Every structure is written in structure tokens, then in C-alpha cells.
Chains A and B, each alone.
Chain A
Amino acid sequence: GQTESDWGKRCVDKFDIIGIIGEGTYGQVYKAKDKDTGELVALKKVRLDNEKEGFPITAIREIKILRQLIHRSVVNMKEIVTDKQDALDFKKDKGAFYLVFEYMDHDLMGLLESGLVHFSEDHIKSFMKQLMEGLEYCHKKNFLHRDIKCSNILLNNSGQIKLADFGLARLYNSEESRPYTNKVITLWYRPPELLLGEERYTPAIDVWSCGCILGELFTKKPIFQANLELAQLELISRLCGSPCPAVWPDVIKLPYFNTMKPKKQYRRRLREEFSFIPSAALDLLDHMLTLDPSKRCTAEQTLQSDFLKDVELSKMAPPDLPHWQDCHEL
């Protein structure tokens, strides 16, 4: 069990780089295949050239958090490789390192953004249950994936889902509060507490982002789409209700509460505007998109929901791909 443990000693020469596949949390993700095994792997890391702090601390966080987490719904970091290092000349060595991840077939963003894939109710059940099982595992280890986006949600053609980029992930502690960056999640998936300036936020920040993803699979359009933080809070208020001390006692505690007020004190119209969603999912959506993070559901409670409690991981339902409609419709 130590052959696979020896890291940093292998070179990137064993991987042939196919090309770049996208932009990750801090750096761009590239694709490669191992010469020895022939396996497709996902590559991505940073550079050691900035001697201000040497090895990046945000990268050290992603290495520490990911090596502790092992789950069927989490991308497993395979190994870590380096550039060609000079013998005996380790002082002049300016070579960088590379993180080796497991490569998945597709990405949820590209599938939805193109509009080709279709999600049935059973497909969404297979999607959300795997998403919450991994999220509950990492939340159980007191870690927060502060960057839940469609580009970081990966799926294989079998139907298995995995989360990807943990570079923006930090550790959570209920006792010791550490101030964090108020802006951390993509504006379309950002929880309302971060819009209002919460620096010490709860693990419920990921539940809100996945809630916007749950509704996005039924409408094929993102729920809240705005270019500014205040405009984002307005769209959230028109659907989930305006932030008010009635539904959110500590909303006054948040700094930007008096600063960022919506136009009116809108009422919650979530169940009305989502009447086409099944009742099992609509109740889940209502709890996941709760304004107050203390009243917002947890990752385990979503797995004990009428929509996901009885879902079987054996019936892994892959998303429907068109066949001859890609050349000309029917």
C-alpha cells in the first residue's frame, strides 16, 4: 500500500497532454493519458515560481482536504507529478508540480448549456441523491466546497456523479469562527447570506447552490440570473421572499441588511411559480431554498426526503442523449 503512496517523485513525462478542457477554481484543467496505463486522467495545478510564499497555500488546502475524502461521489485525486528535476541541482530547480485527478466523461455545464441532454424525474433523482450523499460525507468531515457550479459537477455515461474542484474549499468549525470571503460562490448560485456580507457562514451555503441546480434541471434555465449582487438579491426576493426579520431573525445581524434592501417586501411565491415540479421535489426545493441558513435544510435531511429517501443507487439512470436528432431533428 506504499507503491501508490510514493508521490511527487514521478514526472509528467509519463503523461501525454491531449489539451486543455476548461477553467477550474484557480487554474485551467488539462487532459492527458498515462503512457504506462493508457488511462485518461484530469490534470491541473499551479506554479512554484512566485517565491512570495513558495508553494501555494490554497493548493495545500486542496491537497489536504482531498486526500482525506474518499467516496463514490467524489473525484479521487490519483497522484501528484512534477516537471523534470535536475539531479544534484535541486537549488536551481524551478520546476512546477501537477495534480492528477480522475477523468470523467462529461461535465454537467456543457450538457445543459448546449441543451442536448434531457433529465427525467428518475434521472434527477439519481443525480440529486449521489450529489447529497457526497455532500453529506464532506459536510460530515466539516469541509465546505465554497464553489458549487455546473462545471465542477462531473458525470460518467454510466450515471455516476462526482464533485470536482476543491481548491476553494476550506475547513468548517462550529465552535471556532474564522472570517471568510463574503464573495465565494458564483453569483447565480450564491446563497443570500453571502450577498448580505456574512463572513462566517455555515455549510448550508452548498445546499443553496444545489437547490438552484435542482430547479435548473426542471426548467432547463438557471433560477437566479443577475450580473450584480443587489439584482441577484432582488430575484431571490421575488421567489423565496424578501429577507425579513420574520423569516430570518438574524437577518438584522448581517451587515448589508440595511444597505441592500429589495424594492418591496415581496412574499414567497416559490410553490406557485414551481407548480409544474413534482410534489416530492417541490417540497425539497422549498426547504433547500430557505432564506434563513439556520432554517435551511442540511445535506442529510435531503437524503431523508420523500424525493430521495427511496431512490436506489442500483437503478443509476444516465441522462438521455439524442441519437439521430443531432444530424437533423424528427
Chain B
Amino acid sequence: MSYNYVVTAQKPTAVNGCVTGHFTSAEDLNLLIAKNTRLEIYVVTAEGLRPVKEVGMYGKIAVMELFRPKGESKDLLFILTAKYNACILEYKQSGESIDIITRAHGNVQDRIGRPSETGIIGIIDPECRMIGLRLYDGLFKVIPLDRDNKELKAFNIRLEELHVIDVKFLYGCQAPTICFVYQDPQGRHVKTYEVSLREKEFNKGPWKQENVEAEASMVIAVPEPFGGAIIIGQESITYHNGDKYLAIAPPIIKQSTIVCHNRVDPNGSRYLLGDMEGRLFMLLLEKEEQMDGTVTLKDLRVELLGETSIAECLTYLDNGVVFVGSRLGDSQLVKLNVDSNEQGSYVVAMETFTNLGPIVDMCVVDLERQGQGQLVTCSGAFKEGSLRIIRNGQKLHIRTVPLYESPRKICYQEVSQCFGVLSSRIEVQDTSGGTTALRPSASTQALSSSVSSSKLFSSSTAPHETSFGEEVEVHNLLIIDQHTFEVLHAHQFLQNEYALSLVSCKLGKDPNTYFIVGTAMVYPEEAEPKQGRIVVFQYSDGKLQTVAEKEVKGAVYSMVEFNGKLLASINSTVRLYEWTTEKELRTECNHYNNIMALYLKTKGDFILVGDLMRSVLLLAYKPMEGNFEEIARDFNPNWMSAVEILDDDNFLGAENAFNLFVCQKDSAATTDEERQHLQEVGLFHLGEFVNVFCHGSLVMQNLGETSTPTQGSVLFGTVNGMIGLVTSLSESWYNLLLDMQNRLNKVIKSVGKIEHSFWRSFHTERKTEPATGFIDGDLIESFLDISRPKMQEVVANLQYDDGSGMKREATADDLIKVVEELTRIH
């Protein structure tokens, strides 16, 4: 059995949702920001936001909406997690004691159901009569908001339309009415149904169905003054209400896809829109009131306000301020001015909230040689792409290096006092036949520049057809100084060539330190790329030199240095190259029993292979024979996202279902098959999508050695910006912290009454397993925050049986000191 310990070093920074209401009190205007498993509560002021409370939930916050039923003084909060945990929460403050009360709780998971494509959707009736949930195809779950429904029981209404895009509760209807855009083989349409709590079924909807755009995205519930709904698409915006039909198709919104929406005026006259390129729009509803006292819609107008961060959620705060909640870049508070500045923009940034965004790759390097170490991450995407310099300093100090293009992989080369960064920028087919970038980025603003003149794939006589306006990815290798972080050089790869892997090392008897990039020729017709290159560069005297190229028949997803030899994975093949004295690559041995060899890690002569669906495989080079040989493989199928080697017998992996697991050799050599059976000895639902594992630690080391109860340090970055640390424990320390967790779970009150053991349970759509071999360090480190009566209640009767002795009883203060030592690993 194996024993490990995982702590969060940086909490999730990406904003997954944001809402405005009156949750804390009936008077205050609150802005509830939702990050992964984290809920931040702010109070809107004239200068900005004032934080008041932040709580953690044992689940990924999927739905978050504020509502106020009849008879409540202030708004209540509804939250549905990714694991279908539903709850209703209330804010209660008695002076300085701020507590969140769980009014209702329950699990709304159905035994049978196909999860929908567009994800979990949560809407609440305007009269707060029911909560609408779209969890499965062909099923609409209704939670009636009755005073007696504290268990949040719900029923399912059969839905004829299986593929739904978005749904909202309509305003101004006699009966509760839903409006949804669905997709059938005849395109996309919008339809309406009336929900009946009494009959528990659908009746015919108010207004008829209309054939809408094939790329209809979002539904906007227009309030009572206008009524009806607005459908946002890629090229057209349409308003549907009864017989009234309006459709505007401005040419500006065709350039970029609209992703978010928010209401500014409660009367419904103005709406906010945002696209993937960060532009902020204003949807204006002109009013035509008829000499009958009624307010029909004259026309619809769209005006460009300015550029914001690529936002996941927009929310308008009063007095012209808007919170830009971003998942791909830094969140912002922006001011909307009535007058445009000298540049024509009505938007001015107030504050910038740092968001590590998607951490695709990262490397630990002691730049300042302080023995501490800094973490350099490839963070952000598109215009929000950047490099982040993180150091421990009690708060983390983060330096941001904007790139304005999407970073891919990073590697450090001390010989050149610089970093190697793979990056991609988006250009559009212009009228000249070539491409034109939307904005300048790091690849374009390099001091020196070069382009690959390779003729390896120049065998295609007929170049593929290009139409005007189609987006293309341009991949570059950036050479960035380690002190100034200035783009010293940018090498642009071939057309339709994607940069996938990057390594910096010496090879063979060659003393020169090289930058090596593994690429792939990506064409849209491809049923998996069948062309690629392994290119060797040498950065010397401010110029990047093409040393050699090796043609491969697939995608070079990952490369790694192996005993002075180059280990590269090409589609299903894992190949080992030798660096000859002629400065060229030579194949030694191959392994083929893979589907898509993605992630590779090495330690000595052993090799850990992370497959798309075969999980992890152990490979041995064996220097005598000169060929690979399978040692052991994990037979439980898993979709790998990142792999890592812990020690000579333990291996760490990450799944696409936000789950971490640890495999180990059976360590009992009876049958040769038991050895060949990698046994999954650790299971843990992390809740985050791990992209890169990295050995190292950011803590300041002033010669302190072995003073930690934990052994090893593995850092990882996630999509939501969360950075964590994994470490192994002894059996004595594991049982101590594990027995403590069970005591803390019975003591600590969870938000929404969510069981901690259910939250950390390994969870796919097909399997649900309890957590094993892992100590939730975030739960253990919470012991230093509970009140003193709760501390003694946890340490009461607690006897530790570490071995080589007898079960000594634990003191309350002895456990406080131990956790304080565990807080020093991060």
C-alpha cells in the first residue's frame, strides 16, 4: 500500500460564475464570485468591492443563483455541485460572527440518465415557485420551492426535445413558462412549455416555435416591461415574444463568438455582451409605446463599448461599473463612461484581479539562486496569454509577463540564461491570400526572428484550399531572457505545424546545449496527424540556429532527455533516438503497444508512459539488449491528463475526471503476472484538471533538511489556476492524519451539509470509489482554525499507534504544533 499527502498551494483563481443580489442583507448589494469549489462574497462600494466572507464547499460549484421568495427578508442562495449536491443557503451575521446556514440539502442525481452536452443548467422561476434543472437529455427536473421541501426532492418531466442548448424562465407569463433552444436534424429552433406543479407535466407553451439560427447559443429572459426572450447566436440576434419577431444581424458580432450576457437596466432596455476576443458590447432595446399604454419593441441596436478580458461571466454593478469575470485571463473591474476617450473606447479599467488561468505547462527554477525556487508557468490564452513568476514570500509574490498569445510548453536553459517557450497566435485569412494577425504579440515583437525553411513536407504539389476569414494557428518558439523576460528571438515554424513538445539538454558527446522541439503537421482532413518533425536548435549569440531535423510519421506529443539520448513519443510509438557524432538523430529501439503515447516521464532506465486510455505503462530500456521491454501496466482504464514518477515503485497520475491516483508495483513476486500488475493503491478526487506535474518546491530552504514529516515534493498546475503539492507519508504519519480527518469531519460543519468522504471519492460517470491512500491536507490544515472546544473534541481519546511502541494518547496542543509543521511545506 502507498500513502500520500496533497495540499493546495494556490486556490483556484479562474472565475466560473458571478451574480449580483442582496444576499448578506436586504440593503447591501452583493457580488458573489464563484471559483472552483470556492465562493467569494463581496459588498459593492463606490470605490470597488469589500470582501465580507469566503467559504469552501465540498464540490465544484456548477449552478449559483440568488432568489428571494415571498416572506424572506433578504435573498437566498442556491448552489448545485458537479456531483449533483443541491442546497439552499442563507447568510446570518450576529455581530462579528458570520455564518452561512444550510436551509435545505439533498442529492438530485438520477439512477438512469445520459448527461447532456451543454452541461448542467439551473434556472429559477421569477415568482420563485420552482428551481429548474437540466441534468440529463430528455429530462427536465423541477424542484418546487415549497416551505416543506427541506430535502429538495424533485420530479422529472419527460422532454420530447432531447438536445437542448439553453433554457430560461420567461417573464410575464400567467403560468410558469420555460423557453429553450433545441437542435433537431432540421436545424435549431426555439420552443416553449408551461410547467404545472399541480399536474406535474408540460402543457402547450405560450408562443409558437420558430426556426432559428443553426448556431443559437444563449437564451435571455427579457423582463416584464418588454417580455419574451432574446436569442444570441454567431451572426444574428433575434427577439421572440408572441407574434412579435425582431432580428438584427450586425456585422461586428460575426467576427468573434459571443459567450456571455448580462442585464444592465432592470427595465430591460440595455444588455451587456462579450465575445471571445474580449470586446464588450451593449445591446440596446428601443421602446415604442403604443397609444394604448403598452411598450412594444421598436428595434434592437448593438454598440461596441471597448475591450475587456475574455470573460466567462459579466455582471453590471450600479453606477456604471462592471465586473469582468475571466477564466482565460485576469478578472477586472471596468468603468463604463458615457463619453469616449481619445481612442474611441468607453471602457476604462479600475482594478485587475490576478488569475493564473489555464496553467498548461510550468517549470521550477531558482532564477535568483536563493535555494528557494520560483515557479514559471505558461498561463492564459489568446490575448490573455502570459508567463507568471511565482515565489514564496505570508503571501505569494507573482510577477506577470504578458505574451498576448497562447503559450504551450516551457523549458529552462541555464547555459543561455534564457527560457524556451512554445507559443501559438491566431491569424485570419486576409484578402492578400496570406494571413494577418488581429493583435501584435510576443512572437511578432521579437528582437530577432527566423522562419523554418524546411523542405521535408514540401512534397504536396497542391496546397490545401484556404477561404477568407478562416482562423489559423501560428506556432513559434520564443527565446526569453531569464532576467528581463524580453522576447530575444522568435522562430516561426512551418505552415500548419503545431509545436507540442520542448526540451533543453545536451545529447551524446555533443557539449552544446540545444533547444529541441517536437512538432506535427496538422491538417483538418487528418484522422490523426501523420507528419511531424523533431528539430534541434542551438541558441548562441542572440541567434537561434537550425542544427538538424528528423522526419517522423506522426505527432511528437512529448520528448524527454534519457541518459543523454532523446526519448520521443510519436502517435502510438515511443522511440529512443541516439545523437551521432555527425549531429544527427538515429533510431535505436521502439515500442508500439500504445494508442496515443501522450505523457512521458523517466527516472534512471525506467520510463513511465501515459496513454490516452491505457492509463500508465512502465517501460525499461535495458542497455544490454538495446530494446524496450514492458515491465508493468495499470489495467484499470483511465483517461490520463498528466503523469509523474514519485519513487522507484510509486507513480502518480491525473485523470480527465478531476481524479488523482497512484499506482505501485505489487511488491510481491510470486507469479510474474503479479509483478506485471500495477496495483492502484491511491485514489483521490482532486476536483481540478491537472495539466503538468513538476518536481520541486517553492519554499525557502536555509539548510533545513529532514525536519519535515513529509518526504518528497511534487507541484502541479490546473486549468482553474490552482497549484497544489503532492507528497508521500510514512504509515505512522498516514494513520495519524487519516484518523484525524474522520474526527474533523464529524466536527467541522460543511457548507450545504456535504459529506467530505463523498466529495473526495473517486468519481467518473461510470465508477464511484472511496478515497484511499491520500490525506486531504486542506482538511488537516483546517484544524488550526476551528474553535478550542472543537480542537479538544478532535484530540479526545485519540491514541497514535505509530509502532515500535504502544498507542500513546494525543494532546490538543501537540496536534496544533504538528499541523504548523505541515503548513511549512507550502
Contact = CB atoms under 8 A, between A and B. Distances in A.
A324 interface: yes
Interface of B: 110-115, 136-139, 158, 162, 500, 522, 526-528, 557, 592-593, 596, 598, 612-614, 630, 633, 635-639, 656-657, 673, 676-677, 764-767
A19 B639 contact: no
B571 to A, nearest CB: 11
Given A235-B111, A323-B527, A221 B765 contact: yes
A248 interface: no
B596 A31 contact: no
A220 B115 contact: yes
Interface stretch (A175-183, A273-281, A297-305): A273-281
A313 interface: no
Interface of A: 18-20, 22-23, 28, 31, 109-116, 215, 218-223, 235, 238-239, 272-276, 323-324, 326-327
A33 B145 CA distance: 64
A115 B656 contact: yes
B633 A19 contact: yes
Nearest to B160: A275
Given A113-B767, A222-B766, 4 more contacts: A18-B592, A113-B764, A235-B111, A276-B136
A323 B766 contact: no
Contact of B676 (A20, A221, A239, A326): A20
Contacts of B528: 323
A199 to B, nearest CB: 30
23 contacts: A18-B592, A19-B676, A20-B630, A20-B677, A110-B613, A110-B637, A113-B637, A113-B638, A113-B767, A114-B612, A116-B639, A218-B114, A219-B112, A219-B113, A219-B114, A221-B765, A221-B766, A273-B110, A275-B139, A276-B113, A276-B138, A323-B527, A327-B598
B137 A115 contact: no
B407 to A, nearest CB: 13
A215 B113 CA distance: 10
Q: Chain A: interface secondary structure?
A: mixed
A327 B557 contact: yes
B498 to A, nearest CB: 9
A20 B633 contact: yes
A272 B138 CA distance: 11
Contact of B764 (A28, A115, A219, A274): A115
B111 A273 contact: yes
A23 B136 CA distance: 34
Contacts of A220: 114-115, 765-766
Contacts of B557: 327
A18 B614 CA distance: 15
A115 B766 contact: yes
A239 B112 contact: yes
B563 to A, nearest CB: 23
Contact of B613 (A18, A114, A275, A324): A114
Contacts of B767: 113
Closest 7 A/B residue pairs (Cβ): A276-B138, A19-B630, A113-B637, A114-B613, A110-B637, A114-B639, A273-B112
Interface centre among B111, B137, B528, B637, by most chain A C-beta atoms within 10 angstroms, is B637
B114 A28 contact: no
Contacts of A272: 158
Contacts of A114: 612-613, 637-639
A328 B613 CA distance: 15
B114 A113 contact: no
Contact of A112 (B593, B638, B677, B766): B766
A51 B110 CA distance: 52
A28 B112 contact: no
A18 B630 contact: yes
Contacts of B630: 18-20
Contacts of B527: 323
Nearest to B691: A328
Contacts of A222: 766
A18 B593 contact: yes
A28 B500 CA distance: 36
Contacts of B596: 326
Contacts of B635: 22-23
B688 to A, nearest CB: 15
Contacts of A218: 114
B570 to A, nearest CB: 14
B766 A110 contact: no
A276 B613 contact: no
Contacts of A22: 635
